[PDB]
Amino acid sequence: QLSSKAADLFDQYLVYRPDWLAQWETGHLVEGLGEAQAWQAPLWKALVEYTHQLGQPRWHRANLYQRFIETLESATTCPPGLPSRVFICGISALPPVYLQALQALGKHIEIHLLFTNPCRYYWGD
Amino acid sequence: RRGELGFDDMLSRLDSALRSESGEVLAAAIRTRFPVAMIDEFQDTDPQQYRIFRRIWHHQPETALLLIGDPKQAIYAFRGADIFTYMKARSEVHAHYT
Amino acid sequence: AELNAKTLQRLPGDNWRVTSYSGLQPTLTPHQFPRGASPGTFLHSLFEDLDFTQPVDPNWVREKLELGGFES
Amino acid sequence: QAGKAHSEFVQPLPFTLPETVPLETLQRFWAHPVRAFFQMRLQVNFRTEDSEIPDTEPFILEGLSRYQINQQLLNALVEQDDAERLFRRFRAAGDLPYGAFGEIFWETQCQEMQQLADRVIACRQPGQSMEIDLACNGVQITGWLPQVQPDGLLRWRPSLLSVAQGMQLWLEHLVYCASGGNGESRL
Amino acid sequence: FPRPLTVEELLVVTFTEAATAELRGRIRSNIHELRIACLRETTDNPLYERLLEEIDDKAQAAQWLLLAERQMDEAAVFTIHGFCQRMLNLNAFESGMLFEQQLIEDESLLRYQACADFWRRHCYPLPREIAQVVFETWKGPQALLRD
Amino acid sequence: NGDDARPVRASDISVLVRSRQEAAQVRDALTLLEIPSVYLSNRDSVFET
Amino acid sequence: RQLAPLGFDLMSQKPKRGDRSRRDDDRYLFLEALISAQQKLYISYIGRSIQDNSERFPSVLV
Amino acid sequence: VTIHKSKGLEYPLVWLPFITNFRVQEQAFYHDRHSFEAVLDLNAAPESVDLAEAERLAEDLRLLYVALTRSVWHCSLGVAPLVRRRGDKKGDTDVHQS
DNA sequence: TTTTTTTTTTTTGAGCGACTGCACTACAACGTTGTAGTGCAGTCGCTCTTTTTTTTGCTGGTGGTTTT
């Protein structure tokens, strides 16, 4: 149950916090977090070393996401297999973590994000 | 063995967790979570519950304990309540308000 | 006090439904193949998944029959 | 609220009394009259579901199992049979508690049934079943009476003092004294 | 108090769940009434009048009451067993508890099973001279469980 | 209440008992005089009726 | 719905903009259901109990 | 409504027909008057029986207070010389035991 | 490897404590007898509460029901 809860937290960090795991892979802690960090970052580093020692591939969600951003930002020529225009209807049709990949995709693919806001002025922070 | 739990098992497990050495620091974590307590219906108080409340909020600074109740309404002695726990709580505390 | 129940004048909805075509309706040979809905859908999935430009590989057909559960 | 209410269940029904009415029908009627009106006249017998299997062995004796044990013990002690063989027979079936508690239960039930049998076989005579043919109010009653001794009627049951058993003994005494049979009836 | 506290730091403990719901509704209504009386600088209640007279600032108190009205859904008004279960599930490392457990409402069946196990492991290998006294004390394990 | 008046309905009068047997005694003594009464402390199951 | 935090997750201690939360998602779902209603809105809730006729309070949003 | 189910409620007119009926506790389970801990006496000692009957009488007085403090306009009581003892006319009644 | 029948319920309280009747000796009133106190046994009332406490991922994220 402890391994299942830690794997759930690691999957949630892979989805939402790529910079925390990218810093934990180097071996450096993050200043300003809670008490439950001294047993998670060496566990994550040992997990990365264990999956690198095994025959399983290195790639996961966060590093492939960063590699996708890097290979769409530095590439001058558009790679084949990409569509022309992509419609995104609704707010929950894209979670607010893939917006950097959407900005990378907008350089080569016309993206129409149909946004449903209840107010017409600016009301955010 | 079955991994199940009961209603009194929560009180017994919290009392056994506070009964240990490190669990007092856990009580300090409760002092990091809720630094106040307003406990209604203190006539229906088990001795395990009063032991938990005394271990968490006896004399630590910045935390307040407000036991609101009535000793003339303790009619749940068949269920597990006890007015002698309320009399022990009255003998332990110093202030009284009516 | 007197009371009566109201009678519905018009129908609540017409015959509105999202339907399909089905709603409006020697020892080893393909003639000896078992005829059914499930082998038909299996052959349809085989014709859907297989690429037409690439040549057919026998080990791929063996893997598809192992995944489907037919005879080797 | 414009409907009729529930009318009363008791209604005057037409009924013709037949010629030959058996004694068993009269015994089933005077054992329970409302049940005999339900399950025989309009043939409505309310079938209740059987009890579920208990999750543990019987540690005590109560109810129908205790009544069957007392009935078999009273039928065994009325013929001066060996009670230890019936004890081993009930222990081999699992109806008795395990160990010494079953022996204690069998000892107190054997003491009670021996106290009852000392009164039962104090005035017991060997009697056989006889036939009953009566004609009352133009109605024929045909039946059989079991264990008719020359002293009268002798019945024994391991139950309490109730009025249904008294009604049954009174019906048997009326059907016994109507065709000969001078003597008392005892239960 | 030395510092003002939020809605997620005030702990109210009441045993009955309907009493906690009624107290949560009454505290929400009192928060709304005090927010209205602080925005209007007047009230029809004498205790609310003294509450308005005790504060010098009106805008910050009304903003705090609006934040309390918005955070009343996340209020810490729990029962006894609910607060104990939340403290066990929150700090599971210091307590030594599991993460997912099944809660049973009635423990009478397991108690009767344990009493039957005790009666089997104690009263069965006893001889007649002790089992007679055990039978004189209780007929079976049901009378002992009732005691 | 002051000058306001209210007639006493059947929901105002409440009988405070301690057990279930004396509650059934009160209910049987009250239903004999054509007065219906409810038992708010009735924890009996519907599957036993 | 309100879901208790695990207790040792760092995302609950420090929240960000793009963080999943069941409370804020339901409070925005109620606003989207209020906006999406074109002609008629029919909100129904249990205001009275059927057991002891006790008063039941509605949600904070309603 | 029972006395335990009438705690915290409100009733205009309250009738108490059987408030004089009392129950004598036989089991010896009491609390110490100094340590305030639950003491269960398995032996039939009369001191533990009296110390448990005192707590039973205090619980009955608390039930009487709870049942009396729920009326608003009018409360009615049923008083009678109830005798728990099997003697018919012994010169004394058991109303002081209630 | 085939296949037959069948509609009858029962039982369940016991320990605590008093009322009343008959026997049985101790002792004072008038050797014997009436009154008083206690033991034992058959018979009978009575009476046996009250109640509630909860975490469970809406779609947690390569996800997704239905036609030929």
Closest to A32 (Cα-Cα) out of B25, E6, G15, G18: G15
Range 4-63, chain E: CB under 7 Å to any strand I atom: 15-18
> Cα(A91)–Cα(A116) distance, rounded to whole angstroms?
7
Closest to B35 (Cα-Cα) out of B53, B68, B62: B62
* Integer CA distances (angstroms), A26 to A12, A42, A46, A52, in order: 19, 10, 11, 14
Q: Which nucleotide is nearest to D70 (CA to C1')?
A: I11
**Nucleic strand I within 7 A of Cβ A95:** yes
> Cα(D16)–Cα(D35) distance, rounded to whole angstroms?
20
- Does the beta carbon of F26 lie under 8 angstroms from any beta carbon of chain H? yes
- Does the beta carbon of G57 lie under 8 angstroms from any beta carbon of chain E? yes
**Nucleic strand I within 7 A of Cβ H5:** yes
Q: How far in angstroms lies nucleotide I17's C1' from the CA of residue H85?
A: 9
> Which residues fall within 8 angstroms of residue H56, CB to CB, at 6 or more apart?
H23, H24, H25
> Which residues fall within 8 angstroms of residue A36, CB to CB, at 6 or more apart?
G8, G9, G10
> Which residues fall within 8 angstroms of residue H95, CB to CB, at 6 or more apart?
H20, H79, H81, H82
Helix (H) or strand (E) holding E69: helix E59-70
Paired residues of D184 in beta bridges:
D152
Range 24-53, chain D: CB under 7 Å to any strand I atom: 28, 31-32, 35, 39, 45
CA angle, D137 as apex, D133 and D140 as ends, to 5°? 30
Specify which residue's alpha carbon is closest to the C1' of nucleotide I52: E16
- Does the beta carbon of A4 lie under 8 angstroms from any beta carbon of chain E? yes
Q: How far in angstroms lies nucleotide I60's C1' from the CA of residue E32?
A: 36
Tokens standing for residue B48? 């395990």
What chains are in contact with H, requiring at least 3 Cβ pairs below 8 Å? B, F
Widest distance between CA atoms in chain E: 86
Closest to H33 (Cα-Cα) out of B46, B93, B44, B87: B87
Tokens standing for residue E102? 């099944």
Q: How far in angstroms lies nucleotide I32's C1' from the CA of residue H90?
A: 40
Closest to B66 (Cα-Cα) out of B75, B74, B57, B78: B57
Please list every residue in chain E whose beta carbon sits closer than 8 Å to the beta carbon of residue A4.
99
**Nucleic strand I within 7 A of Cβ F22:** no
Q: Which nucleotide is nearest to H22 (CA to C1')?
A: I49
What chains are in contact with G, requiring at least 3 Cβ pairs below 8 Å? A, E
Q: With an 8 Å Cβ cutoff, are E90 and G60 in contact?
A: no
**Nucleic strand I within 7 A of Cβ E139:** no
Asked whether residue C31 is marked as a ligand-binding residue, the answer is no
> Cα(B64)–Cα(E89) distance, rounded to whole angstroms?
24
Residue that is written with structure tokens 């204690």 in the block: D104
Strand order in the sheet with D152-154: D128-136, D139-149, D152-154, D184-186
> Cα(G7)–Cα(F41) distance, rounded to whole angstroms?
40
Closest to A24 (Cα-Cα) out of A34, A12, A10, A8: A10
Closest to A53 (Cα-Cα) out of A45, A65, A64: A45
Strand I bases near protein CB (under 7 Å) are: 8-13, 16-19, 45, 48-63, 66-68
Closest to D109 (Cα-Cα) out of D137, D163, D138, D71: D71
Cα E100 to its chain centre, rounded Å, is: 20
Helix (H) or strand (E) holding B64: strand B64-68
Cα E127 to its chain centre, rounded Å, is: 49
> Cα(D134)–Cα(D22) distance, rounded to whole angstroms?
10
Q: How was this structure determined?
A: cryo-EM
Q: Are B17 and E92 within 8 A, CB to CB? A: no
Range 58-77, chain E: CB under 7 Å to any strand I atom: none
**Mutate: best of H27, H31, H57, partner B, most B CBs <10 A:** H31
Q: With an 8 Å Cβ cutoff, are B85 and H36 in contact?
A: yes
**Nucleic strand I within 7 A of Cβ C41:** yes
Three-state secondary structure call for residue F9: coil
